[PDB]
């Protein structure tokens, strides 16, 4: 039986090498647009993909289950897959026989008539003012503007409009377009030929290197005012090289650039005030464009078509490209289509092919390791929004995230992937998480349709709706399933090799299908369903992600200890009370979500690698527990509850916390009273970046001593409720370097009967660098707070003002960037005649400010 | 057949008779009525000193009676439950109850007994425990009313956390144990609001504490309300069958308090405020659709009512409130619950009129047999009762709004109750 | 007999993939005007066409008739056509010269 | 049982019981139909019109009748939406005034029509 072991080891190593080679080939193939592949390579690539799936499964089985029967099965599968690989190779070799270029579809749009653009005037004039901006604009240094957004939004159209409008007030100009994979010689020759068609008429035939072309451009632009537009920049090196030709200084010249990428725009412009962000049209403008496009002369929509029109316009989203293409589709110049045909289109040609080809540029440009992470978005329903933590943990579980470096955490890699997807304008971010990051994301609908078609053409994902998207006609091997309409019934007797199941139905029939037959699973996601108990979760042996959130589960089988591979375990909103003991024996576990009302077993110290722990109970617990807490060393998020926890042992807890070197966020929730932990001389962890005490009824005393800017060099969030605030407490907050967000409560003002005291700031300038929001709830003063001009980035101020102090000046010209102020007045001490006086006074003080912020007196 | 509603406008003439009748008969003395809301039923002339020493005698008799039962329950017990421990508890109970002592000693011993009763074999065992707690805090209320204890110390006693976590537990559990079967047989248990618990003479003392906090610290009063509603949901007075969004969790009260101190948070909400307001709008929508089930609508009404009564203005959204016009609907349902509770009180009082009903119909130790209000029909009673029920229904029929979307929750309970009452009044009036 | 059923299925799936590839090649060839093809490719393409016909017939027979005699005939035909395909491949490789 | 029937030509419809005319309603993906009404008893036309209204996808339809008044396709019929061609080549069996379901809402698509009415009004061409 020894030789069995050795043979199996050898076979597995061979498979690993073969997998590397296959992935290299597939990544190489997947770059070519579909119009340049031939059928042979496409078919062969599909078959290679299937073989890759099978070999991955075999390798995983060996890694998990390692006896006689297992080794025998593994050897059988090994032999079979090797045979199939050889056969496919011969097949390809048998029928191999060796035996122009199209133009960019976006080129025709430059010759569209100008009387067909609907709502440009406003944006056009705003951009023009952003360019000139004054009377002596012809004497200021060179300036660069940039425009960003997603495809089809109308960037080059706006640039063309402004250029044609104001080109008269310059000497020379040009309008050049850079593509995805550019040749720098061609770009420089284009600039030269655009500057003077007569002198450099034959410049496209010259053969010099880039240095001499750059020298020519520099010599021609000497002592001239120029306006130059550069279009469709796709990365950084291109701009880094082209920037050399505009190195000299020239008073009065202007540059414009347009792009889809945000970092490129940040690299072009100097200040973040020189960035224009395109935004979609409003509803009325979109509707007029639609009507004009189709009902062109009548401009009268019949009534029966109103509501389908509105739903279609909502699906378009205000993007002119989609509006135009769908309007041409429904126009059918011969005849307007019928209402039922409109419905059919809504539920579900040259212009359509062009739109698809245009939008796919951003997909064909991604790095190879980001393409699966994008297709994975086709699992979720249409219009809802997606939590990012769910996405990141599922990506890690599926195996899309990996690296070879020794000192890297997969969580931050996944976060980087998400931020990169947002950076390329393919995802709309929404909200702010409770750990300082994005909360959720949204996807445009046409993009969603493109993604669904792409992922369906490769058996990446199979969706189950009843009206559309039924079971594939001829497919025996399905890997990832997504149940959205519970009306259907599922066979699930041929789906031996599943990998991931997800149910989106509130329906009872959703829990009907049997799961214990998918002997190889990695992702089980039943969030929201009404399943009641799962005893079959053991015997799965392959899981990585177990998501049970918002389900009616009362208790877990005491066999989860068998799942030696389990990254995530999500239990929130369930009815569980006490976790089974065997949970201690899950050595690989990186994330544990739980409610504070659940009892944890004793030996929690063994769970190293824990990177996220949510809502510890910390009640009815002895000391060895709080000492074990000090062993989880690589832990980046923590949340406590202090509910029944006895505040006599806080010192051990603070030492255990100070033991965690890597850490970003921290919460402490306390019902009432004075917080008896985190005493002075604590030495917080160095990398801390976010701190919060959301209690609002449990105070600190004067202030923690460890808030000095040396101990907490990094901090971008703070939320504290003190007992009594001093005047030289805000000073210590001025000392903090970053402190983007801040919120302080004065406990004595509300709960006790103390009165609002005016704090005074002194002895310094630039007190609050990078403070965009501040909420001094309980304590307020506008002028004396900010002397000389400090915090030149604030945008929202919250302060309190007694009516007694009607007779201090409310001048808002210390602070340039003000945009919103929320005030509340205390009127019992002073009479109403002083009250309305102070009201009108601060109103005028807000009106004088040039930015003209908004007020609220409350 | 449905008996038609009485249609009378309230007269001071019969007001006099009904007023002295309520002021004379025992159970209606310590309770107040909805009819106090009417224009002219004035002239109460009541003094609380006599009612107070009456309550003293009632408490003495009831503690003595339960002690009597405790000895013999220790005599023959099915698995010894250390009944002499509860006996020592009632021993120190009577001790503290009889003597005058210094305020500090009373504080210490009250806190000790209460904190050690804090920490399942028999059911009436637990009933005895609950009655011990209720009698202890009744002693507290009487002692405060006896001017032997200041206000400062009373607050320092009640405002500390553990006492707050006990008041609600007792206030809900005792009411359940005492009235649930009566409410079920009467068929009104589906209309039982924690808001109107302290309107029975059995729970007047609680009311005192309540206004005391409205005296001094409104925050703690609202906290006590938010606590007692959650405790009522927990012990199954109103089953929702899945989960409560915002009542059992500690981090929800924090958000509610934060909003209550600075309201502008509602305009610029955080995430927890966001999903709070989403759940509120969803429950509102569920409440304002007529062919959803009755239990869901009642549950939604109870939740929204508690939120609005303790945290004012959070449930309000200006525009849609007028198109829906649900505010007056809420008031109508509240009025219905109040009047239904009073009708149940009258129905329970009727049992005192039975020739053979020595057994109390209110609950364990509700009334000591030393008083045991008798069968003696008096001159006025036979007329005053029917007049009072007719006046109740007449006063109710006016303020209720009439629309079938809202008719389902306020009209038919009143109609069915009027039917049951008009059917069973005579048969009891004969014999 | 269980083993035979398992084998025939595998052979049929292999034939289906091979048919896809052959049709791709033939469609690619049939675009060139006759004045630019050379004789070798033309002859090889004719033979490939004939093999395609035979394999289609075998697949159809399996789909319609599906026992022992049928499965035996189908297995025989399967083996023979696979052999012929290999032989034609070697033949083409033997006399290919780029010039 | 013959589902998938997409074209059916010249049904007999004579000496037939009701379960036959009810079965006719099961052929759902059927795009062409032709009837004869030869010996078919005109007492059961309602079941026939329901069975026809059950076919969602449909383009052409014929009804041939020897003589007399056509006693089927009564008003309140709800024809299939996609209908595009309709013909009654009888020329000796009339309708009464006009079917009510000829309004342009119920038949948005129609490129062919052939009818023989008993007596034409002046406000009948209007509906056309
Ligand atoms: N205001 C408008 N009114 C009518 N049509 C418009 C308007 N703005 C843009 N379009 C149309 O949208 C189409 C695409 O716009 P355009 O190509 O300028 O966007 P883009 O930002 O350049 O896209 P990409 O990022 O792919 O280059 C053009 O055909 C143009 O006619």
Residue numbers in the entry:
A (entry chain A): 22 to 87, 113 to 145, 151 to 399, 407 to 865, 869 to 919
B (entry chain B): 128 to 246, 250 to 561
C (entry chain C): 22 to 87, 113 to 145
D (entry chain C): 664 to 791
Could you pull the original sentences from the published paper?
Plant nucleotide-binding leucine-rich repeat receptors (NLRs) are intracellular receptors that play a key role in the plant innate immune system by sensing the presence of pathogen effectors delivered inside plant cells during pathogenesis through direct or indirect recognition. Sr35 was first identified in a landrace of the Triticum urartu relative Triticum monococcum (einkorn) and confers immunity to Pgt Ug99 in bread wheat when transferred as a transgene. Direct effector binding to the leucine-rich repeats of Sr35 results in the formation of a pentameric Sr35–AvrSr35 complex, which we term the Sr35 resistosome. Electrophysiological measurements show that the Sr35 resistosome exhibits non-selective cation channel activity.
To circumvent cell death activation for protein purification, we introduced substitutions in the N-terminal residues L15E/L19E (Sr35L15E/L19E), which are predicted to be essential for Sr35 membrane association by analogy with the ZAR1 resistosome. The final 3D reconstruction of the Sr35–AvrSr35 complex contains five receptor protomers, each bound to one effector molecule. As in the ZAR1 resistosome, five Sr35 NOD modules define the base of the circular protomer arrangement, and a helical barrel formed by the fivecoiled-coil domains is buried at the centre. Unlike ZAR1, the leucine-rich repeat (LRR) domains at the outer region do not pack against each other in the Sr35 resistosome, which might explain why this region is more flexible. The modelled ATP is nested in a groove formed by HD1 and NBD. Instead, the γ-phosphate group of the ATP forms a bidentate hydrogen bond with Sr35 NBDR157 and NBDR311. Of note, the coiled-coil domain of Sr35 contributes considerably to the interprotomer interactions: the C-terminal half of α4-helix from one protomer packs against the C-terminal sides of α2- and α4-helices of the neighbouring coiled-coil protomer. In the cryo-EM structure of the Sr35 resistosome, the EDIVD motif (Glu-Asp-Ile-Val-Asp) and the adjacent Sr35 Y74 mediate the packing of the LRR domain against the coiled-coil domain. In the cryo-EM structure, AvrSr35 binds to the very C-terminal part of the Sr35 LRR domain, supporting a direct recognition mechanism of AvrSr35 by Sr35. Nearly all residues that contribute to recognizing AvrSr35 are from the ascending lateral side of the last eight LRRs, and many of the residues interact with a single helix (α10) of AvrSr35.
